Amino acid sequence: ASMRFTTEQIDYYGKACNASEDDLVVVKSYKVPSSETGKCLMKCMITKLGLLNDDGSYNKTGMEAGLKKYWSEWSTEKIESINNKCYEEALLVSKEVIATCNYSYTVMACLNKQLDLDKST
Amino acid sequence: ASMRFTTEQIDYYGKACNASEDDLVVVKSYKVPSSETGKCLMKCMITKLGLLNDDGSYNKTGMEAGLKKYWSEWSTEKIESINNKCYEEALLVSKEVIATCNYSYTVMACLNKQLDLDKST
């Protein structure tokens, strides 16, 4: 289990976020694109999904709703537990950090770690 | 379609390649780790899968065999077409480029672009 994005999602939010195809295939290769647009793609995508607020901060209720909508395979129990843990880590971040395009990857790393660790039933 | 790795593959080849969990969750978040070991993880993994030679260069027959093994939902015809194209691109790359850790991501990106252009098979 991981926070996988499908080809369809990548293609849709790639249009929404003005990515090139080269940006998109680099994302799908597990890498952050080097273009100006491509390095902010992830932020743009997960904001449009409601996982982040427009200021870039973790949105607790939006994250839950998005996980339930698109990553329901994780189970509601694990979703609630992981979301509480990652939100709690989010509280400790500065405004400066949240402003960057990289913060999105930080959040996703947290969700992926906690998914690797969570034992909720 | 993309050259997706499963959570189990990432875990296995993470052990094989001496990655830390923080490295692995950054890969699963679609980012290259900045650690010395982590930034080489992809290379190490796809070398162990036989897609690259031990010297880092593209292995035509090993790529075809890995495609057929690990991504067997794709037709032989699609596999051979993406392999031929991305091998042809590989022939133009220097020894200095193949020596890098990042070249692996470039190979993955080429395969991912050719996958996006051959969905009818």
Numbering used by the authors:
A (entry chain A), B (entry chain B): 1 to 121
Give the exact sentences the study uses for this entry.
There is good evidence that aphids, like other insects, use OBPs to transport semiochemicals across the lymph into the sensilla on their antennae and deliver the signals to the ORs, where a behavioural response is initiated. The OBP3s from both aphid species have a similar structure to other classical OBPs i.e. six α-helices connected by extended loops, with three disulphide bridges formed by the six conserved cysteine residues between Cys17-Cys44; Cys40-Cys101 and Cys86-Cys110. The two OBPs also have some unique structural features which are different from other classical OBPs. There is a significant groove in the surface of the aphid OBP3s (indicated by an arrow in Fig. 2) formed primarily from the N-terminal region of the chains and parts of helices α1 and α2. No significant internal binding pockets were predicted by CASTp37 or SURFNET38 for both MvicOBP3 and NribOBP3.
In the two molecules of the asymmetric unit of MvicOBP3, each chain partially occupies the other’s groove, with Tyr30 inserted deep into the groove, forming an inter-chain hydrogen bond with the N of Phe5 in the other chain. The N-terminal residues of the other chain cover the second face of the groove and these symmetrical groove interactions form the centre of the monomer-monomer interface. The two molecules are related by very close to a twofold rotation of 179.4 degrees. PISA predicts that an interface of this size is biologically relevant rather than being a purely crystal packing interface. The interface generates a pocket, which assessed by CASTp25 has a volume of 390 Å3. However, it also binds to β-pinene, (−)-α-pinene and (+)-limonene so this one OBP could be responsible for transporting all four components of the alarm pheromone blend of this aphid. The MD results of MvicOBP3 showed that Tyr30 is displaced towards the protein. The most likely explanation is that Tyr30 is involved in the crystal packing/dimerisation in MvicOBP3 and is relaxing towards its probable monomeric conformation more like that seen in NribOBP3. MvicOBP3 is in an open conformation (Tyr30 away from the pocket) because of the interaction with another monomer.
